[PDB]
Amino acid sequence: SEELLFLDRETVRACVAGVDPVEVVESVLRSHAAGRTTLPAEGYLPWENDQGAYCRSIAMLGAVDGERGPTYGIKLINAAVSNPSIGLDRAGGCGFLFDPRTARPVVLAEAAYLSGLRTAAYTMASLRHLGPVGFDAVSFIGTGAQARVHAALLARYFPAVRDLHVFDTERSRAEAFTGAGHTVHVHDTAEAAVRASHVLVTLTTVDDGYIPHDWFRPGSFVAHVSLDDLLPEVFFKSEALFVDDLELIRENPRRVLGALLADGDVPVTGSLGGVLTGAVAPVRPRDGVVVSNPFGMAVLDVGLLAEVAAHARSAGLGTTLDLLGA
Amino acid sequence: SEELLFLDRETVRACVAGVDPVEVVESVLRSHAAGRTTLPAEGYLPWENDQGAYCRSIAMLGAVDGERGPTYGIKLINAAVSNPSIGLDRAGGCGFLFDPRTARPVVLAEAAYLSGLRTAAYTMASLRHLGPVGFDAVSFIGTGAQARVHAALLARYFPAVRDLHVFDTERSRAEAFTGASGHTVHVHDTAEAAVRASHVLVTLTTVDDGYIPHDWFRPGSFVAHVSLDDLLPEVFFKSEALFVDDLELIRENPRRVLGALLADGDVPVTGSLGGVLTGAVAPVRPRDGVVVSNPFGMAVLDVGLLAEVAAHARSAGLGTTLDLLGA
Numbered sequence: 001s002e003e004l005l006f007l008d009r010e011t012v013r014a015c016v017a018g019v020d021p022v023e024v025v026e027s028v029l030r031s032h033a034a035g036r037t038t039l040p041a042e043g044y045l046p047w048e049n050d051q052g053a054y055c056r057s058i059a060m061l062g063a064v065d066g067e068r069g070p071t072y073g074i075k076l077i078n079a080a081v082s083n084p085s086i087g088l089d090r091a092g093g094c095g096f097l098f099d100p101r102t103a104r105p106v107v108l109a110e111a112a113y114l115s116g117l118r119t120a121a122y123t124m125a126s127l128r129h130l131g132p133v134g135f136d137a138v139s140f141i142g143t144g145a146q147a148r149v150h151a152a153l154l155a156r157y158f159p160a161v162r163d164l165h166v167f168d169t170e171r172s173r174a175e176a177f178t179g180a181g182h183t184v185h186v187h188d189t190a191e192a193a194v195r196a197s198h199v200l201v202t203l204t205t206v207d208d209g210y211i212p213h214d215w216f217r218p219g220s221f222v223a224h225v226s227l228d229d230l231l232p233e234v235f236f237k238s239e240a241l242f243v244d245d246l247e248l249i250r251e252n253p254r255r256v257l258g259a260l261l262a263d264g265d266v267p268v269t270g271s272l273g274g275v276l277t278g279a280v281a282p283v284r285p286r287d288g289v290v291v292s293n294p295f296g297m298a299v300l301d302v303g304l305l306a307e308v309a310a311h312a313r314s315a316g317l318g319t320t321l322d323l324l325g326a
Numbered sequence: 327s328e329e330l331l332f333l334d335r336e337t338v339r340a341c342v343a344g345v346d347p348v349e350v351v352e353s354v355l356r357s358h359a360a361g362r363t364t365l366p367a368e369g370y371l372p373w374e375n376d377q378g379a380y381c382r383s384i385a386m387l388g389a390v391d392g393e394r395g396p397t398y399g400i401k402l403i404n405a406a407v408s409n410p411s412i413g414l415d416r417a418g419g420c421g422f423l424f425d426p427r428t429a430r431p432v433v434l435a436e437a438a439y440l441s442g443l444r445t446a447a448y449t450m451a452s453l454r455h456l457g458p459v460g461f462d463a464v465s466f467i468g469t470g471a472q473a474r475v476h477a478a479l480l481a482r483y484f485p486a487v488r489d490l491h492v493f494d495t496e497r498s499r500a501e502a503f504t505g506a507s508g509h510t511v512h513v514h515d516t517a518e519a520a521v522r523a524s525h526v527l528v529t530l531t532t533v534d535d536g537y538i539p540h541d542w543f544r545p546g547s548f549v550a551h552v553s554l555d556d557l558l559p560e561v562f563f564k565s566e567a568l569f570v571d572d573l574e575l576i577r578e579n580p581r582r583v584l585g586a587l588l589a590d591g592d593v594p595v596t597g598s599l600g601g602v603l604t605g606a607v608a609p610v611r612p613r614d615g616v617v618v619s620n621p622f623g624m625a626v627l628d629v630g631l632l633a634e635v636a637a638h639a640r641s642a643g644l645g646t647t648l649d650l651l652g653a
Contacts, residue, residue, distance in 0.1 A: 008650055008651055010651065047396070047398060049427045049428075057387055059369045061385060072383065080429045082427070083428055083429075092429070094431055098381075102414055103375075103383060103418075104404060104419075105420060321334075323436045
């Protein structure tokens with residue numbers, strides 16, 4: 001026989017709600033730091049649709065020799081630039097886990113929501129160890145799907161946050177944003193959103209940098225999720241600068257931190273993994289700005305999918321697909 | 327709304343009943359030869375399981391622009407060497423087609439049967455153009471799922487074939503192998519014996535090390551090197567002709583012997599089966615020596631076949647609609 005445990009978005013939502021995603025992200029980061037993770041070259045299929053718009057499929061294999069047992073799986077994210085144009089999210093797709101023994105794909109989950117959750121879980125982990133102790137306000141630039149799952153995880157992990165300061169270049173999308181015990185303040189400008197708190201999360205899809213060092217309050221933190229918002233001086237003037245994987249950042253020099261690494265020495269303090277294993281000391285904001293610049297790692301999604309599946313099995317959630325059907 | 331056409335194996339078997347898999351493969355090879363495909367590098371995740379068996383996942387993407395317009399998809403095929411020893415098929419997994427405009431996955435299929443079918447269909451294409459004319463015997467080394475589907479396609483495309491000369495390291499498996507109704511199976515006790523018994527060989531093993539020398543082949547012999555590691559180097563160098571699917575796929579995967587020899591220097595590659603079909607290179611049937619066919623296995627064939635399967639499923643109103651969002 002041949003069976004798949006199948007998890008739609010709402011079921012993955014329900015399973016993430018029932019497990020501790022930040023603890024899962026910290027455990028895989030600890031596994032990664034000890035070289036007990038694998039991220040092989042991704043599958044990349046680019047094409048142009050009949051709209052003259054860029055489309056791609058990215059097939060990201062990953063393995064974790066982690067703090068439970070070996071986990072093996074794949075994240076498949078497909079995107080078209082012209083999707084927002086016709087009322088769809090840019091990205092969609094699927095994730096699998098593989099049986100360690102037989103290699104069979106035994107778990108199929110909708111993956112786009114889980115991808116946004118992975119990033120927000122990494123943000124919360126970063127803030128736990130590297131943010132101010134007791135911040136009560138968060139600022140967001142870009143108020144899409146990624147802002148909502150960040151707002152959801154703030155209510156779980158940082159309930160002292162009662163106030164969200166938001167800017168989006170698309171004003172209507174900022175006005176519709178409600179967050180998750182959060183009061184949403186909509187700002188005319190990006191600068192005013194940044195100045196209104198000690199904690200920034202950039203969630204934009206821009207190519208052109210625009211955030212100077214001078215917008216940050218002393219004792220500030222930025223989770224640079226969108227990777228191209230901060231101007232070069234922010235990295236050079238940072239009180240501290242933490243990454244997820246410096247080799248992934250170095251390999252992607254179109255992004256500002258990768259570009260700066262190509263040009264010479266940059267004051268990188270270390271990785272969040274190094275902080276978790278005790279191999280680098282944490283640095284919290286005091287005088288300047290602490291920068292977290294995570295590139296994102298598909299091993300975190302495989303880790304999260306394995307915790308999500310185990311909760312689905314023990315909660316009786318999802319549906320079994322017969323792959324054969326005799 | 328994230329709908330997804332789901333095709334279980336039986337639904338795939340049903341939809342395939344009415345397709346000519348050789349014709350689909352030939353079409354996609356002609357498309358590939360004219361640069362009207364995209365064949366990215368394969369995703370590869372190897373590991374060892376509890377019982378020290380080599381496991382792998384392979385994620386292979388492809389696009390084909392032809393027959394029914396631009397097609398985009400992926401084959402995820404996973405294998406453990408352990409699986410036979412606990413009564414499981416070696417290989418299992420799934421295929422997706424992507425919507426050409428949104429890139430969203432819109433078809434999910436069981437893929438292990440379709441994968442064997444694609445392989446068999448390529449072999450039949452290769453034999454039609456590069457084999458002896460009116461061979462009536464084929465030899466198989468390895469009598470698994472692949473041998474069964476190869477025998478099914480021999481019966482449809484080469485009905486003059488009445489003798490299958492088979493070896494398997496597990497003789498129980500060879501004893502069990504019947505082929506199709508119009509086949510007589512002769513079990514041999516060594517690979518050599520099965521090779522010497524005909525002029526057409528298909529290697530379907532999971533070996534990592536070469537063991538088949540040039541001296542085993544009769545003059546005017548053919549070999550579909552499907553398992554890709556059975557033939558020793560001297561077979562490649564002494565070959566009357568050597569045909570590939572895609573030289574750059576082979577060159578980029580030197581964990582298989584032909585891949586290794588091309589990094590070592592000059593190997594006498596005649597051309598591609600695509601080149602034969604388009605006229606870019608002359609077919610060479612066996613006369614004096616052994617003709618070798620060494621296809622690595624291109625995802626564009628799988629995307630090609632799955633697109634035809636989906637088209638048939640749609641028409642007959644088959645398969646199941648999956649909600650990837652839910653309530």
